[PDB]
Amino acid sequence: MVKIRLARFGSKHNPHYRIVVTDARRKRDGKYIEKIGYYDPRKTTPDWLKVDVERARYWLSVGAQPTDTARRLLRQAGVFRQE
Amino acid sequence: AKGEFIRTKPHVNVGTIGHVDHGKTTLTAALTYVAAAENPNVINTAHVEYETAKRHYSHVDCPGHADYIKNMITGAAQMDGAILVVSAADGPMPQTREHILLARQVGVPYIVVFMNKVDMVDDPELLDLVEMEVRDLLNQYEFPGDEVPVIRGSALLALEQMHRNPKTRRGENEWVDKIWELLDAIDEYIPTPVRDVDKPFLMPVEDVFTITGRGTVATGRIERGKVKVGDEVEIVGLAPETRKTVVTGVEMHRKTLQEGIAGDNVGVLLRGVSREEVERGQVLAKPGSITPHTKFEASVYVLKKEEGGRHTGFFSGYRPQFYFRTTDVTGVVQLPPGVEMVMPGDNVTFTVELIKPVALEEGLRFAIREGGRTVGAGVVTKILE
Amino acid sequence: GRYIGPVCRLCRREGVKLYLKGERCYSPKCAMERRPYPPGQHGQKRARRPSDYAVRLREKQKLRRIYGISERQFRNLFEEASKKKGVTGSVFLGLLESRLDNVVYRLGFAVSRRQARQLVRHGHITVNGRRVDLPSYRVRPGDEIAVAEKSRNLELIRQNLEAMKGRKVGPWLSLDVEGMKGKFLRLPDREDLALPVNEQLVIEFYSR
Amino acid sequence: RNLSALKRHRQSLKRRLRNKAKKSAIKTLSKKAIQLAQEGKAEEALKIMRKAESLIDKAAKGSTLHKNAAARRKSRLMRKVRQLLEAAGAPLIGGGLSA
Amino acid sequence: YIPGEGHNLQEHSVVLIRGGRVKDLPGVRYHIVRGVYDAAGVKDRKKSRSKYGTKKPKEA
RNA sequence: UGGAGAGUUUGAUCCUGGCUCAGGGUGAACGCUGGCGGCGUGCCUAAGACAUGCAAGUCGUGCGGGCCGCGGGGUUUUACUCCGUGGUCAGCGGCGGACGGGUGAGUAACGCGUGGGUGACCUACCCGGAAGAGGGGGACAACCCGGGGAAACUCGGGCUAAUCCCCCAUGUGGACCCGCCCCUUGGGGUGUGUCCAAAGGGCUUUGCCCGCUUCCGGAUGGGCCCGCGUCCCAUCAGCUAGUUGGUGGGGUAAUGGCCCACCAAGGCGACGACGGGUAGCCGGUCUGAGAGGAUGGCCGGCCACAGGGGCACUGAGACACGGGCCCCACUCCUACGGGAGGCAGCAGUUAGGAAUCUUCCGCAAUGGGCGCAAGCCUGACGGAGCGACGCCGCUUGGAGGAAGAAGCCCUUCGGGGUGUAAACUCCUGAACCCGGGACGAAACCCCCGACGAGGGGACUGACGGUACCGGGGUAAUAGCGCCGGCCAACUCCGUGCCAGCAGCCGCGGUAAUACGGAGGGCGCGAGCGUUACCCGGAUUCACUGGGCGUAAAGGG
RNA sequence: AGGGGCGUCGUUCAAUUGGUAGAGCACCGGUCUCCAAAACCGGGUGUUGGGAGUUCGAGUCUCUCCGCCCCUGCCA
Ligand SMILES: C/C=C\C=C\[C@@H]1O[C@](O)([C@H](CC)C(=O)NC/C=C/C=C(\C)[C@@H](OC)[C@@H](C)[C@@H]2O[C@H](/C=C/C=C/C=C(\C)C(=O)c3c(O)cc[nH]c3=O)[C@H](O)[C@@H]2O)[C@H](O)[C@H](O)C1(C)C
Ligand SMILES: Nc1nc2c(ncn2[C@@H]2O[C@H](COP(=O)(O)OP(=O)(O)O)[C@@H](O)[C@H]2O)c(=O)[nH]1
Ligand SMILES: [Zn+2]
């Protein structure tokens, strides 16, 4: 099904992912359906992570199983937090 | 699907000499099919192994016969001892004589004579006339002939019993017991030399195979030091420039070995190396150690007539064939001022210009042949080029 | 790697006495001072009228040998100078100056350029705190260049920091003779850099 | 030397056999029904045809007639029959067909 | 064509050809690289060696 | 924000015009030489053939067993081995093996690109909504036993469990026929008739979690169709019978001659049909002032293929790379009657070739399949290894130091040059030695809160004792091209149309900046040259931007 | 690794009568010429593939090497 995982960008020993709503079957770094954010595992930059609000929630309201390590970031960006 | 190989008993290389049509090539296929009963897992020279209950063996059975000198002369060095085979029917023939002389030219200490073809023409003197003329020629050639473990038996028969049924323990055939006599009186008398695992690795290359799926393998008895998988090495001698690769396999008689050391005829699989890139004569040494050279000098000792050598002497501009290791190269000769007419019996120090770059090295020894006869010996001095 | 060899040899060949030695090549014998004529078995004869090519080659080797840079490095900078908005002549020189081993020299610390390199290359130099060992590093506007701690004691940093008594720096670089700092206030200029080199003549070397 | 994909083949054959049979049926019934629709057997025509129409949607339940590949087989049946009865017959027993 | 002065190529030597003609020899349209296969370098050649094969001689 | 020309036809000139060169580029190869690191990148040929190992599995929270360790002996012992039990071997059943990975052979085509159409359709798992999950029957494995066989396996007899199979029911609904209304290609509503559902599994148990069934909708992914665009030869000019259309059938998820009857004679073509050659297409890449030209390797998208060829089965999906059948070729085993097998998966071998890598480390990360979960599998992937193949960074020392050693080479016998170069003197300290030493990793999960939001806790690092950091610390690599002109750089000897050079013009016939060596210089530097190929220069196919009286060029 | 062949001036070809090595061109000097061609004078220019072996001496008869053609060899 349609998922919400991470696509690896940035060269060797410089991981930089892209939070995207790809299709389960795609390749990790193949054509994604829509980028909604990125993530920097080394934090090198006061913006090591950023995610699109209204979007993430949208794809969730239409069945988009987020990876575990993916969901971690959606949360850390306060996506589910219903207040 | 390979079968590992563990060491327990001390290794030792041997071979069989004699006259073409006598025994040797047959007692080898006798000694092997014998020590395979009480031991688990057991034109061109065939290196066949056989293990006893006191030591591990190699055994280089040279086809013998003339023409096959260059191929025989090689393995001669690789062996710590030689089983001089003689037939009862005939006796000391040209080959039995030729092989023994060449057996001396090429180092090889101690001799263990075996009287085969005993099962032929029973004669009081015959069986005791042969054991005579043997020591007559062996000693005429400076060998311990008067104290050489001479055994007696028929190999042709000794084997036909083992082909009926594998297992055939001690003296259960009497004939396959005389094979246990020489095979026993062999791990005795002939000792074990000094195998220094301290010197920078180096093994001459005899044959070169191309084991499918793995690559090119270079057989040969290690001359010093050791080598295991992962060690870098160099192919010195012959070819444009000394190649450099890595060993990725070391095996002892078709069975995966672990670490080979001086004294074992172990084959080595060389990392990505075409089979044209490796040939006879070359040496596998530790990187940096030894190099390829053409010209050199040597404390060469020119033999004399009374010892097979020449008897007329050569001049400056003579082209003989030198045997450094498992190979043979040719070269021009231009010695120091004067010192011309180097007839038989001299220790002259001339210079050679081999046409093929061979792994030279001050200290290393060689020999000289020309016209099918050992014209002389020697040892490199100052490496000119 | 950055040439390394008879240098006053260039002092000569280019005919515009260079400063590749800092002290001697600044004294009464920059070699030029005794042979204002190019090296070689000849170096002093009827110099045929220089070809339109020769002229531009020389006007380029000059400007590049001044900084010791390699051709690869040099040409890359020039290309970079082009694409960047603004006169390529100025800009080129600008960037060419922003070089570190240079700003090391353009601030004392080192007697020469060839020296200012072995300096930065050996740590002794420092940017906004953290140090750098790369000459090619291009200093920006607002970055002071300090020396190192284990350096302020060495025999060399002494004399070099000594001559700094009184002597002044270009209007684009300040300097604390004791605090051994100095801020890269602004990128220099064709003018500020009174170099014996016609850039537009070099700009033209990288054309045909 | 081998894999547990074999499991997948064994089944393969079984299931093959399963709906391979359900199909033969529907085919046989469909034909038998129409084969009467012109004879005039209006009564037992709609009788068999009503049965055929059963195994159709029936097989459709699984992976036999997968989907509305059944819906088609049906209309072609209760259209081939109906258009055979009005060839002098009148719909007797109220079978599948509806007037 | 066989460059340099003096070669060791006989009726069965194996060489390695490359592009390059020779304006005087009407048929010759290729050159024989030197220092590759049966073709040795040029003896003594101290000048342009990269071409002509011949390896850097140690002044010795 | 962007445009350079030169050599060469003549005794000389101008023009025409070809040839050639300076620039950039490359999955490169060859020569000489070669120190470090980072990020890249590496069979362009035989889509030749391949040893070996690994590349796809997983679920006992679907089901019955074999078997082993064990609560404790079931009866009282070792009887019914019941049950407790975490494991384990298959079997049955399910989901995934259709993705991920490889290759470019084929294909000039709706294959691809682009924009659209589908009232002509499909979509597992994922979301949202609606209604359900009531009865019953049955089989085949496993296992037991008998049998054939060299093997691979196979046959018979008989037990048995399910989320396996089947019958009846409920019909929210849906399917279908005919009717009607709306709407307009087969879509939406409605009425009569007919036909169709389903499975239980685990707990912490009248409730949750995981499933099941039918329907409507969302997502995503697709099939089919269409307009325009897509190489060379016209010395290839005519092509076509399922051919072109029709009617009625078969077929499919669905349109269609897709296939078939029958009827009609059509359909296509210089706007290049047909045929031959070549070729995967694109984003892009190189070059170019631009317009263009060339190209399509790594990365991403699409297509095609899986030893050659044909075909179906299973299934949401394949006519299926590590599934099946068959023919053929080749490999292998055979007890000769029949067996096993496909690296264009990751490493590796061999052949061919000018030439293209380790039979590595790890699932720690990211991503995937299965699972309630723990977790399992993952040669995808994250890394390490080899090769200057490419780019970027760094080193081989910095400062001193003679009207200037030696040697070497010139020399108008004074001298000149290599040369501040060295020697030599202070000097910083590549390497290396010692200690310290990561980020990449925070969630699945545990707990409070309801397993929601939010808060807290723990395990986990292949690359690595590597990067990086402190301290200690030796002066410690240089080559290659070229020096007639174009084109930066000149002198001596040897040689004597010889030997040789050579991109073009052309150099060598005894004084040769053009051969060979030497000294000297120029260019660039861990590289520098060579060969091959593309663009440029070439307004030399000219749209931008040319020409035809006599230079090629007006048709009689 | 082991069989068998060929190899002669610079070249194409002889001495299978074992007695220093023979012919045509090619070419080399002498004259003419700036240098050649032509013309006239006059020339054997030789690693008998190498190096050793017998012989009073070897192209020839023995070996052993070199390069090449050929036929079989060759999985630690
Ligand atoms: C000889 C071939 C290859 C040699 C290779 C190398 O040799 C060696 O360099 C070796 C090192 C010493 C070497 O140089 N060998 C090189 C040489 C070494 C020679 C050494 C020792 C001698 O002393 C003078 C030694 C044999 C000596 O001779 C005597 C022999 C007398 C013979 C009379 C002949 C008689 C009746 C006869 O009928 C006869 C015959 O049969 C054949 C031919 N013609 C004849 O007329 C006696 O027996 C003594 O013992 C090493 O061994 C290397 O490692 C090697 C094996 C690679
Ligand atoms: N009469 C007899 N013949 C034997 C004996 N040993 C071997 N042979 C035979 O002699 C022939 C040659 O034997 P082989 O060993 O090949 O001789 P080698 O190769 O010269 O040692 C073969 O037929 C052997 O079987 C024996 O003891 N007596
Ligand atoms: Zn100076």
PDB file of C-alpha atoms (C1' of nucleotides) in Angstrom, chain C residues 1-4 6-9 12-13 20-21 23-24 29 31 34-35 37 39-42 44-45 51 53-54 57-58 60-61 64-65 70-73 75-76 85 111-112 114-115 117-118 121-122 124 134-136 150 154-156 204 207-208, chain F residues 1-2 4-6 22-25 391-404 409-410 416-422 426-430 469-473 475-476 478 486-491 519-526 528:
ATOM      1  CA  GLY C   1      52.654  20.234  -6.195  1.00  0.00           C
ATOM      2  CA  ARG C   2      53.097  24.027  -5.923  1.00  0.00           C
ATOM      3  CA  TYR C   3      56.311  24.223  -8.015  1.00  0.00           C
ATOM      4  CA  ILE C   4      59.211  24.229  -5.524  1.00  0.00           C
ATOM      5  CA  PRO C   6      64.857  27.853  -8.265  1.00  0.00           C
ATOM      6  CA  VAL C   7      62.455  30.773  -7.722  1.00  0.00           C
ATOM      7  CA  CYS C   8      64.392  33.970  -8.422  1.00  0.00           C
ATOM      8  CA  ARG C   9      64.634  32.141 -11.763  1.00  0.00           C
ATOM      9  CA  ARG C  12      63.932  37.009 -13.853  1.00  0.00           C
ATOM     10  CA  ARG C  13      62.150  35.280 -16.774  1.00  0.00           C
ATOM     11  CA  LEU C  20      59.008  34.676  -3.854  1.00  0.00           C
ATOM     12  CA  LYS C  21      61.624  34.814  -1.079  1.00  0.00           C
ATOM     13  CA  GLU C  23      63.752  38.732   2.504  1.00  0.00           C
ATOM     14  CA  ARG C  24      66.568  38.264  -0.034  1.00  0.00           C
ATOM     15  CA  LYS C  29      70.122  40.818  -4.875  1.00  0.00           C
ATOM     16  CA  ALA C  31      68.744  38.089  -8.490  1.00  0.00           C
ATOM     17  CA  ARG C  34      72.273  41.636 -10.969  1.00  0.00           C
ATOM     18  CA  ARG C  35      70.466  39.999 -13.882  1.00  0.00           C
ATOM     19  CA  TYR C  37      67.475  39.238 -17.849  1.00  0.00           C
ATOM     20  CA  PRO C  39      67.769  32.635 -17.121  1.00  0.00           C
ATOM     21  CA  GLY C  40      69.370  30.193 -19.529  1.00  0.00           C
ATOM     22  CA  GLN C  41      72.427  29.848 -21.739  1.00  0.00           C
ATOM     23  CA  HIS C  42      70.936  32.772 -23.645  1.00  0.00           C
ATOM     24  CA  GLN C  44      70.216  38.123 -22.822  1.00  0.00           C
ATOM     25  CA  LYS C  45      69.898  38.838 -26.538  1.00  0.00           C
ATOM     26  CA  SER C  51      53.958  37.298 -30.199  1.00  0.00           C
ATOM     27  CA  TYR C  53      50.389  34.926 -27.634  1.00  0.00           C
ATOM     28  CA  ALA C  54      53.697  35.216 -25.750  1.00  0.00           C
ATOM     29  CA  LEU C  57      51.051  33.919 -21.630  1.00  0.00           C
ATOM     30  CA  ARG C  58      53.696  35.923 -19.754  1.00  0.00           C
ATOM     31  CA  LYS C  60      49.453  35.294 -16.947  1.00  0.00           C
ATOM     32  CA  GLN C  61      52.398  33.233 -15.669  1.00  0.00           C
ATOM     33  CA  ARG C  64      49.999  33.145 -11.123  1.00  0.00           C
ATOM     34  CA  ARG C  65      53.620  32.725 -10.065  1.00  0.00           C
ATOM     35  CA  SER C  70      49.218  25.554  -9.796  1.00  0.00           C
ATOM     36  CA  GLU C  71      47.697  25.922 -13.261  1.00  0.00           C
ATOM     37  CA  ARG C  72      44.738  23.705 -12.420  1.00  0.00           C
ATOM     38  CA  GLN C  73      43.965  25.750  -9.327  1.00  0.00           C
ATOM     39  CA  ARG C  75      42.383  28.342 -14.115  1.00  0.00           C
ATOM     40  CA  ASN C  76      39.554  27.125 -11.909  1.00  0.00           C
ATOM     41  CA  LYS C  85      28.430  38.865 -11.629  1.00  0.00           C
ATOM     42  CA  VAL C 111      58.047  36.756   5.185  1.00  0.00           C
ATOM     43  CA  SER C 112      56.990  35.246   1.845  1.00  0.00           C
ATOM     44  CA  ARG C 114      56.004  30.104  -0.096  1.00  0.00           C
ATOM     45  CA  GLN C 115      56.440  30.463   3.668  1.00  0.00           C
ATOM     46  CA  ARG C 117      51.944  28.085   2.900  1.00  0.00           C
ATOM     47  CA  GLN C 118      54.205  25.869   5.056  1.00  0.00           C
ATOM     48  CA  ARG C 121      49.896  23.720   6.145  1.00  0.00           C
ATOM     49  CA  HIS C 122      51.551  23.127   9.514  1.00  0.00           C
ATOM     50  CA  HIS C 124      50.125  27.549  13.029  1.00  0.00           C
ATOM     51  CA  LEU C 134      44.504  24.377   3.757  1.00  0.00           C
ATOM     52  CA  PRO C 135      46.017  27.244   1.711  1.00  0.00           C
ATOM     53  CA  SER C 136      43.219  27.045  -0.855  1.00  0.00           C
ATOM     54  CA  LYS C 150      51.986  26.436  20.292  1.00  0.00           C
ATOM     55  CA  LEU C 154      58.361  29.720  17.987  1.00  0.00           C
ATOM     56  CA  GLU C 155      61.422  31.573  16.698  1.00  0.00           C
ATOM     57  CA  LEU C 156      59.803  32.444  13.360  1.00  0.00           C
ATOM     58  CA  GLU C 204      42.287  37.529 -22.795  1.00  0.00           C
ATOM     59  CA  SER C 207      39.915  33.105 -24.606  1.00  0.00           C
ATOM     60  CA  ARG C 208      41.289  31.438 -27.766  1.00  0.00           C
TER      61      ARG C 208
ATOM     62  C1'   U F   1      26.715  38.692 -20.273  1.00  0.00           C
ATOM     63  C1'   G F   2      27.819  36.689 -25.585  1.00  0.00           C
ATOM     64  C1'   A F   4      39.640  35.533 -31.639  1.00  0.00           C
ATOM     65  C1'   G F   5      41.972  32.548 -35.576  1.00  0.00           C
ATOM     66  C1'   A F   6      46.427  30.187 -38.001  1.00  0.00           C
ATOM     67  C1'   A F  22      45.435  25.540 -31.362  1.00  0.00           C
ATOM     68  C1'   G F  23      39.910  24.424 -27.461  1.00  0.00           C
ATOM     69  C1'   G F  24      36.499  21.292 -24.758  1.00  0.00           C
ATOM     70  C1'   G F  25      34.872  16.204 -23.686  1.00  0.00           C
ATOM     71  C1'   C F 391      37.231  15.169 -10.280  1.00  0.00           C
ATOM     72  C1'   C F 392      38.499  17.974  -5.651  1.00  0.00           C
ATOM     73  C1'   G F 393      42.225  18.683  -1.544  1.00  0.00           C
ATOM     74  C1'   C F 394      47.552  17.855   0.285  1.00  0.00           C
ATOM     75  C1'   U F 395      52.871  16.561   0.166  1.00  0.00           C
ATOM     76  C1'   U F 396      57.823  16.105  -1.628  1.00  0.00           C
ATOM     77  C1'   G F 397      60.087  21.633   2.648  1.00  0.00           C
ATOM     78  C1'   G F 398      60.023  27.337   4.470  1.00  0.00           C
ATOM     79  C1'   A F 399      64.227  31.392   5.615  1.00  0.00           C
ATOM     80  C1'   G F 400      68.890  32.392   4.826  1.00  0.00           C
ATOM     81  C1'   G F 401      73.321  31.903   1.658  1.00  0.00           C
ATOM     82  C1'   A F 402      79.387  33.636  -3.272  1.00  0.00           C
ATOM     83  C1'   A F 403      81.298  39.829  -8.467  1.00  0.00           C
ATOM     84  C1'   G F 404      78.734  32.924  -8.025  1.00  0.00           C
ATOM     85  C1'   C F 409      77.786  22.808 -21.445  1.00  0.00           C
ATOM     86  C1'   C F 410      78.753  26.868 -24.301  1.00  0.00           C
ATOM     87  C1'   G F 416      79.089  33.132 -19.865  1.00  0.00           C
ATOM     88  C1'   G F 417      75.187  29.581 -18.023  1.00  0.00           C
ATOM     89  C1'   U F 418      73.019  25.802 -15.037  1.00  0.00           C
ATOM     90  C1'   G F 419      72.420  29.291  -9.842  1.00  0.00           C
ATOM     91  C1'   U F 420      70.217  31.014  -4.518  1.00  0.00           C
ATOM     92  C1'   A F 421      70.154  26.263  -7.093  1.00  0.00           C
ATOM     93  C1'   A F 422      73.351  23.470  -4.179  1.00  0.00           C
ATOM     94  C1'   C F 426      69.050  28.323  11.671  1.00  0.00           C
ATOM     95  C1'   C F 427      64.001  26.093  10.832  1.00  0.00           C
ATOM     96  C1'   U F 428      58.491  24.387  10.943  1.00  0.00           C
ATOM     97  C1'   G F 429      57.636  18.795  11.241  1.00  0.00           C
ATOM     98  C1'   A F 430      54.270  14.276   5.658  1.00  0.00           C
ATOM     99  C1'   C F 469      41.367  15.323  19.254  1.00  0.00           C
ATOM    100  C1'   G F 470      46.157  15.743  22.642  1.00  0.00           C
ATOM    101  C1'   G F 471      51.142  14.814  23.037  1.00  0.00           C
ATOM    102  C1'   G F 472      55.882  13.030  20.619  1.00  0.00           C
ATOM    103  C1'   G F 473      58.180  13.622  15.905  1.00  0.00           C
ATOM    104  C1'   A F 475      63.633  17.068   5.607  1.00  0.00           C
ATOM    105  C1'   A F 476      61.378  13.498   4.090  1.00  0.00           C
ATOM    106  C1'   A F 478      59.526  13.736  -9.727  1.00  0.00           C
ATOM    107  C1'   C F 486      51.490  27.356 -36.574  1.00  0.00           C
ATOM    108  C1'   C F 487      53.326  27.552 -30.848  1.00  0.00           C
ATOM    109  C1'   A F 488      55.720  29.219 -25.297  1.00  0.00           C
ATOM    110  C1'   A F 489      61.336  27.674 -25.617  1.00  0.00           C
ATOM    111  C1'   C F 490      68.440  27.685 -28.849  1.00  0.00           C
ATOM    112  C1'   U F 491      73.254  26.244 -28.750  1.00  0.00           C
ATOM    113  C1'   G F 519      73.689  21.412 -22.224  1.00  0.00           C
ATOM    114  C1'   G F 520      70.244  24.912 -22.085  1.00  0.00           C
ATOM    115  C1'   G F 521      65.014  26.597 -22.049  1.00  0.00           C
ATOM    116  C1'   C F 522      59.316  26.274 -22.207  1.00  0.00           C
ATOM    117  C1'   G F 523      54.669  23.904 -20.568  1.00  0.00           C
ATOM    118  C1'   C F 524      52.328  21.216 -16.829  1.00  0.00           C
ATOM    119  C1'   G F 525      52.911  18.321 -12.666  1.00  0.00           C
ATOM    120  C1'   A F 526      51.320  13.040  -9.742  1.00  0.00           C
ATOM    121  C1'   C F 528      52.337  14.119 -18.358  1.00  0.00           C
TER     122        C F 528
END
